Structure 1
Amino acid sequence: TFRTLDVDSITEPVLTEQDIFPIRNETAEQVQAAVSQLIPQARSAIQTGNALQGLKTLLSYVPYGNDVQEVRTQYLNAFVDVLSNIRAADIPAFVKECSTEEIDNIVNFIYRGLANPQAYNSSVLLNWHEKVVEISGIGCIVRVLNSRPDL
């Protein structure tokens, strides 16, 4: 019977996410190289005990795209490993000196971490969430709700 045939999907094509969010102006191998330069700096900053500078350097660029899940998950592995190695007393002094765009990137990537607890320690991500929202306010979560879907 006719009632179940989807005509709308072919007679009125809906907006795509790239009609809402601008296309990435970098190729997949170009962003994969840019992150592969940063992950070794982020790992090295843990060994010198400077994990705060490990985050400040890792956070200087972020990968996005549905074509880059492998390097997005490698960047998230490094991000959660860096956040797990910062001492909990350093967080308030570091968060107040981040820009609004660095804060937006921190609260975005703690959200990607909280989505996968079998890989990532939620206990440190929730501690970071409490302190980032306490110091920078509710609007940083509002910017994550509104953020791009391929971050």
Structure 2
Amino acid sequence: RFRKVDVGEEVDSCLRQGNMTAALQAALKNPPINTKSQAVKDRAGSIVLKVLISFKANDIEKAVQSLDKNGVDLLMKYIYKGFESPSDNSSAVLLQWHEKALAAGGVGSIVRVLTARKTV
């Protein structure tokens, strides 16, 4: 009986400007991280995965290398967002950014994604 009742409880203007690396540098300006908002977090990703898919493989190396250490850590949080619901083939591109990003950031850039208490 008794024991049953529990108790105890702007980006487009840089992209079409050709030097689209300047767009990605701009895409990192909109983190929702500190906010309590949730619809904005769905907007934040869509503004970046549209960018990630645009790169030629001739550039995806420098597009990582031109980031600062925060930039790589920032990027990895966007990478692990696209994997949560892939596009019809875009996983083929995220896994290619991941290759470059992990080369720059090392596994340490993953760990402060796993431990990130507030996120984009």
TM category (shorter chain) comes to 0.7 to 0.9
Task: Name 1:51's counterpart in structure 2.
Answer: 20
Task: Name 1:8's counterpart in structure 2.
Answer: 8
Higher helix content, 1 or 2: 1
Residue 148 of structure 1 and its aligned partner are, at CA, apart by 2.0
Runs of 4+ with >3 A deviation: none
Q: What one-letter code is carried by the residue in structure 2 that aligns with 1:43?
A: D
**Contact 2:72/2:104 (CA < 8 Å) preserved in 1?**
no
Equivalent-residue separation in structure 1 for 2:113 and 2:43 (angstroms): 20
Residue 116 of structure 1 and its aligned partner are, at CA, apart by 1.3
**Contact 1:114/1:120 (CA < 8 Å) preserved in 2?**
no
Structure 2 length as normaliser, TM-score? Answer: 0.85
Structure 1 length as normaliser, TM-score? Answer: 0.69
Superposition pairs for residues 6-85 of structure 1, below 5 Å?
6-9=6-9, 41-64=10-33, 67-85=36-54
RMSD of aligned Cα (Å): 2.2
**Contact 1:45/1:51 (CA < 8 Å) preserved in 2?**
yes
**Contact 2:77/2:119 (CA < 8 Å) preserved in 1?**
no
Task: Name 1:104's counterpart in structure 2.
Answer: 73
**Greater relative contact order (Cα < 8 A, sep 6+):** 2
Equivalent-residue separation in structure 2 for 1:130 and 1:4 (angstroms): 52
- Pair 89,66 (structure 1): closer, same or farther in 2 beyond 3 Å: same
Q: Secondary structure at the match of 1:85?
A: coil
The runs of 5 or more residues in structure 2 that have no matched partner are: none
Superposition pairs for residues 87-102 of structure 1, below 5 Å?
87-102=56-71
Superposed CA deviations along residues 72-95 of structure 1, whole A, max 9, x for unmatched, are 111111100011112222122232
The runs of 5 or more residues in structure 1 that have no matched partner are: 10-40
Identity of aligned residues (%): 32
